[PDB]
Design a protein around this ligand. Structure first.
Ligand SMILES: Nc1ncnc2c1ncn2[C@@H]1O[C@H](COP(=O)(O)OP(=O)(O)O)[C@@H](O)[C@H]1O
Ligand SMILES: [Ca+2]
Ligand SMILES: [Cl-]
Ligand SMILES: [Cl-]
Ligand SMILES: [Cl-]
Ligand SMILES: [Cl-]
Ligand SMILES: [Cl-]
Ligand SMILES: [Cl-]
Ligand SMILES: [Cl-]
Ligand SMILES: [Cl-]
Ligand SMILES: [Cl-]
Ligand SMILES: [Cl-]
Ligand SMILES: [Co+2]
Ligand SMILES: [Co+2]
Ligand SMILES: [Co+2]
Ligand SMILES: [Co+2]
Ligand SMILES: [Co+2]
Length: 329
């Protein structure tokens, strides 16, 4: 699977983990692209399990580093008119959202702590403006909670589950009816769009108890591009990027949707003819991207802490089952 990259990002051990008297049980090796965990736990030390992936981000890794390495070559493809997807997958609290969104002249914000989504909107605007491309950008943001779809961007949207239909004009496509798409007018409008997104998600975790923790959220960008050549020829392209912050790993039943995604990715990597797209909402919505000429990436997040051993081992196993990479001698 040249086209499907699986990478691992170990976040810093944290304060809560110290106070529980946890210790680091995971060793990352960016050069050998390995992650080792002592599976025995504490005094085992005979129990070391090692995994190999496309990339392993050690401690020195910053937000820009994940961006240049995972995202930039995918936006290249998106800008050439392809449809791509990037997943963040892992235990709650391990960095899926920090990676996808991150945190905030830069006066009130920490741009170094910006994640994938705002950096993506920035490059889109910077690259397309520089090369003289006439363009327009729109985004939708939806969440999936217990197999029901909710629009995070509808101002008047109460509650209401959106409805998804097959699209008989495309056998791989899908139509989410009523889905709001904002037009993005500048680099910084993303921040306000993520704000509106969060307010709304917060509401729905009250009147609903759909915790962003237990939900998938799908942030989709569509770019309409027109290039004019030397002679005044017009070249028209439509790119699409899906940035997905998955439901927490920990119970591995949105548990079933995660697993379906796993089989979908494994069938793609292995080229087996049976690809179970229809078995979850997430994979139906995404079949268009995953199934064509494309690039796909999973950022598997983990905590280094001994207290997280089981969920960390499971996340590693999931990512390994996804794209199986033999360990080096
Ligand atoms: N690579 C990282 N570096 C520094 N802090 C991080 C990193 N990843 C996560 N955190 C912090 O850890 C907490 C959990 O991260 P978050 O992305 O919300 O987890 P998840 O989305 O996987 O539940 C957040 O407070 C975040 O600020
Ligand atoms: Ca660490
Ligand atoms: Cl380490
Ligand atoms: Cl690390
Ligand atoms: Cl960091
Ligand atoms: Cl600039
Ligand atoms: Cl607008
Ligand atoms: Cl605007
Ligand atoms: Cl506005
Ligand atoms: Cl199946
Ligand atoms: Cl089945
Ligand atoms: Cl295995
Ligand atoms: Co480039
Ligand atoms: Co420039
Ligand atoms: Co500029
Ligand atoms: Co589902
Ligand atoms: Co049908």
């Amino acid at each position: 699977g040249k086209n499907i990259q699986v990478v691992v990002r170990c976040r810093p051990f944290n304060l809560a983990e110290r106070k529980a008297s946890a210790h680091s049980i995971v060793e990352c090796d960016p050069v050998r692209k390995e992650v080792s965990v002592r599976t025995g736990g504490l005094a085992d030390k005979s129990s070391r399990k090692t995994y190999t992936f496309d990339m392993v981000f050690g401690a020195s890794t910053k937000q820009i580093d994940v961006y240049r390495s995972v995202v930039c070559p995918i936006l290249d493809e998106v800008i050439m008119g392809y449809n791509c997807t990037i997943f963040a997958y892992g235990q709650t609290g391990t960095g899926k959202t920090f990676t996808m969104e991150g945190e905030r002249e830069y006066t009130w914000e920490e741009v170094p702590l910006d994640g994938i989504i705002p950096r993506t909107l920035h490059q889109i605007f910077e690259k397309l403006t520089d090369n003289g491309t006439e363009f327009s950008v729109k985004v939708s943001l939806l969440e999936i909670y217990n197999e029901e779809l909710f629009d995070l961007l509808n101002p008047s949207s109460d509650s209401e589950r959106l409805q998804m239909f097959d699209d008989p004009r495309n056998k791989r496509g899908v139509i989410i009816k009523g889905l709001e798409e904002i037009t993005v007018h500048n680099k910084d409008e993303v921040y306000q769009i993520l704000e509106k997104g969060a307010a709304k998600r917060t509401t729905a975790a009250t009147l609903m108890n759909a915790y962003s923790s237990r939900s998938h959220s799908v942030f989709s960008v569509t770019i309409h591009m027109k290039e004019t050549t030397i002679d005044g020829e017009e070249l028209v392209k439509i790119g699409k990027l899906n940035l997905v912050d998955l439901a927490g790993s920990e119970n591995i039943n949105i548990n079933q949707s995660l697993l379906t995604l796993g089989r979908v990715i494994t069938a793609l990597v292995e080229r087996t003819p049976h690809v179970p797209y229809r078995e979850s909402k997430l994979t139906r919505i995404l079949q268009d991207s995953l199934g064509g000429r494309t690039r796909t990436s999973i950022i598997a997040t983990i905590s280094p802490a001994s207290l997280n051993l089981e969920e960390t081992l499971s996340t590693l196993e999931y990512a390994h089952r996804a794209k199986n990479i033999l360990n080096k001698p």
